[PDB]
């Protein structure tokens, strides 16, 4: 097979270097052994039969932040990854990942919950259990379907596959049988009344998920040509139109200091709608009209002119008014920023409250009280995760001694650059000393009581033992958590075992031999 | 076919509880399950989106940032001067000290990069005058004035690149 490995890798680059327009980001390991290289598309005639099996390049309007992550996902995601792209991926590693998926999917079915409930903590609607959902079952039982939508130059992970299962984010069907429908608008699921309401022809259609469904004459006549015949559909009774389009609102989220809601029920010009165009009952249309006629008078909302997004900004304290400017939101899949208004930025107030710690020692934290790296902490620290700080404090104190042994004047710098927690108002005289005093340092180990010296020492002694118990491999992971003062990884514990290694590996590799996995272990 | 026994034996027919139909008694069950588990391990983090006929439903798991620095005040406190020509008064307060202290700082950085590398600055220029003026004298301090007093057009023809 060693000969075959070369026959693959030699022909592999032939496939890449012909098909990758971006090889430099793929394999930047060598730059001078080749020019800067790209690949270029060219117009072509098409056979009237063979191209039927092709698919479209796009079905949607794509923004710039997606295009980069899509081309990056197309080519470079796997080339830089450890496991490698799905193309040249071995059967064994694909098979290993496939077990861990199955081990996770059944835990979700073991709950009996639904799709939307797991994701959402205040769901509007609730769909199916997952024992009945065909898609989730189709993914669980067939491994190849997991790989179809995953692009060839992409990595084969667990998280990406479970996304499809717990959310069917698939778009239209880009067969050459489907009809490209233009108007596809997607409103939020709180503007809806009954789900049985008639189908908005202007808005998004369920038929686009499969071209075989939108392969009817009406769809082809719509996009490809103009109409000549007016075809009449049965209308609805004035009662049935309303009954479908009834909305219901919390009575407590009616107050005049929330314009995100109240402006939904006024025209563009600034005139109140009827209940019908508002999709409401009688009393809920009263309780809003009072608030408009009152909010008009507190000048949040206009009397007669056009509604403005500044008016649509609901009222609240300075923080939620200020933070929402300061709050820049970033995907963790993709480093780009969401522009304001382009995303629902989320916060459970009740959960943050209940997520706090019911156990707290304010005295134990008086040492680290003035010390803070971040602006403020929304966390109420435990006893354990407090010890981590006092050891961080001890550490920075040790290096001051390390530098002072080499001659550095420690007191000289701490007068110029140390930043107090309490900063007065900024003026022309205060801003230069304080902008130099940005840094936050611990106190001297010398100017202390023994118990204050003991805790910083004992705290350092605890975590020094844990990292000895923790293996060496996951050096960085401790350093990620060491900043944010998370102590879970630091909490490791291995238990005793009387079994010999030969009995172990002979037993484990036997097990794995059944599922495949001819490759034994080596420890 | 498509049928097993263990699903039948592990099954146990029972009677319906309040959970199956009644929301409040059901939602009390759901919260007891989500406490132990964390969705982000199963799905990473993403725009948690689900789409009905034409209706979406979102609860993304993002990373929030709040960048703050004391210099960002810009001395712009609200003092009735939001608009009117009283506004532009609020800008021209430090419009003198702010200019001057800036011009101080290019001359720091420019000079430090020129002092530290006068030699290459002297050497790289002379190599170019030779190709233009081969086998002749090269008065640096005199010819250096021709590196500057030239217009943007003439500077290109001799030196091959343009700056001012």
């Amino acid at each position: 097979t060693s000969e075959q490995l070369r026959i693959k890798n030699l022909n592999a680059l032939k496939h890449e270097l012909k098909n990758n327009p971006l090889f430099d980001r793929a394999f930047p390991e060598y730059k001078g052994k080749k020019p800067e290289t790209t690949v270029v598309k060219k117009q072509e005639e098409l056979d009237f039969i063979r191209s039927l099996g092709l698919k479209e390049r796009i079905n949607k309007n794509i923004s710039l932040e997606e295009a980069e992550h899509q081309n990056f996902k197309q080519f470079v995601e796997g080339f830089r990854s450890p496991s490698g792209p799905l193309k040249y991926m071995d059967h064994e590693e694909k098979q290993k990942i496939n077990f861990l998926i199955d081990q996770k999917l059944e835990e979700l079915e073991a709950t009996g919950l639904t799709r939307e409930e797991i994701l959402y903590d205040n769901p509007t609607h609730t769909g199916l259990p997952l024992n009945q959902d065909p898609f989730f079952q189709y993914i669980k039982n067939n491994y190849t379907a997991r790989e179809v939508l995953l692009k060839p130059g992409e990595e084969y992970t667990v998280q990406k596959i479970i996304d499809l299962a717990l959310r069917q984010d698939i778009g239209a069907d880009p067969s050459q049988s489907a009809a490209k429908l233009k108007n596809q608008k997607v409103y939020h699921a709180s503007k809806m009344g009954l789900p049985s309401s008639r189908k908005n022809p202007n808005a998004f259609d369920n038929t686009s998920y499969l071209g075989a469904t939108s392969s009817t004459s009406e769809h082809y006549i719509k996009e490809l040509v103009r109409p000549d015949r007016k075809n009449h559909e049965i209308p609805l009774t004035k009662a049935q139109t309303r009954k479908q389009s009834i909305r219901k609102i919390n009575y407590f989220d009616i107050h005049w200091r929330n314009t995100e809601l109240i402006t939904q029920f006024v025209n563009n010009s600034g005139c109140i709608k009827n209940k019908i165009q508002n999709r409401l009952t009688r009393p809920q249309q009263k309780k809003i009209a009072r608030t408009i006629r009152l909010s008009r008078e507190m000048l949040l909302m206009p009397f007669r002119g056009y509604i403005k997004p500044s008016d649509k900004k609901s009222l609240t304290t300075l923080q939620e008014d200020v933070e929402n400017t300061v709050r820049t939101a970033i995907n963790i899949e993709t480093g780009h920023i969401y522009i304001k208004g382009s995303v629902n930025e989320y916060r459970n107030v009740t959960k943050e409250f209940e997520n706090l710690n019911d156990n707290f020692d304010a005295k134990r934290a008086e040492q680290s009280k003035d010390y803070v790296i971040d602006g403020n902490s929304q966390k109420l620290e435990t006893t354990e995760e407090l010890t981590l700080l006092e050891a961080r404090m001890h550490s920075a104190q040790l290096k001051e001694k390390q530098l002072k042994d080499l001659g550095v004047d420690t007191q000289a710098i701490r007068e110029k650059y140390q930043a107090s927690p309490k900063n007065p108002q900024l003026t022309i005289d205060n801003i230069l000393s304080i902008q130099t005093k940005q840094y936050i340092y611990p106190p001297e180990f010398e100017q202390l009581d023994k118990k204050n010296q003991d805790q910083f020492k004992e705290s350092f002694s605890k975590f020094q033992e844990k990292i000895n118990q923790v293996p060496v491999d996951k050096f960085a992971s401790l350093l990620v958590h060491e900043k944010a003062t998370d102590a879970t990884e630091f909490s490791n514990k291995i238990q005793e075992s009387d079994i010999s290694l030969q009995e172990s590996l002979e037993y484990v590799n036997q097990i794995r031999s059944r599922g495949g996995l001819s490759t034994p272990l080596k420890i | 076919s498509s049928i097993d026994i263990r699903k039948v034996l592990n099954n146990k027919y029972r009677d319906s509880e309040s959970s199956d139909f009644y929301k409040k008694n059901r939602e009390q069950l759901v919260s007891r399950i989500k406490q132990d588990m964390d969705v982000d391990s199963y799905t990473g983090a993403t725009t948690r989106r689900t789409q009905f006929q034409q209706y979406y439903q979102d609860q993304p798991s993002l990373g929030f940032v709040y960048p703050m620095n004391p210099g960002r005040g810009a001395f712009m406190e609200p003092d009735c001067r939001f608009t009117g020509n009283d506004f532009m008064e609020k800008i021209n307060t430090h419009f003198a000290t702010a200019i001057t202290s800036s011009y101080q700082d290019l001359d720091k950085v420019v000079k430090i990069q020129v002092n530290d590398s006068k030699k290459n600055i002297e050497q790289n220029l002379e190599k170019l005058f030779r190709e233009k003026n081969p086998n002749k004298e090269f008065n640096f301090d005199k010819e250096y004035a021709r590196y500057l007093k030239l217009d943007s057009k003439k500077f290109k023809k001799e030196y091959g690149y343009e700056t001012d």
Binding site: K248, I249, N250, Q264, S314 | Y22
Partner: peptide, 28 residues
């Protein structure tokens, strides 16, 4: 809030009865 919806707890999740299915598959 921009998206408000009232919890209609009187509504029941599971229908206690059967119905002719609306959108079947095949003709069984």
């Amino acid at each position: 809030v921009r998206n408000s919806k009232a919890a209609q707890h009187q509504i029941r999740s599971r229908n206690f009865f059967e119905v002719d299915p609306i959108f079947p598959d095949g003709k069984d």
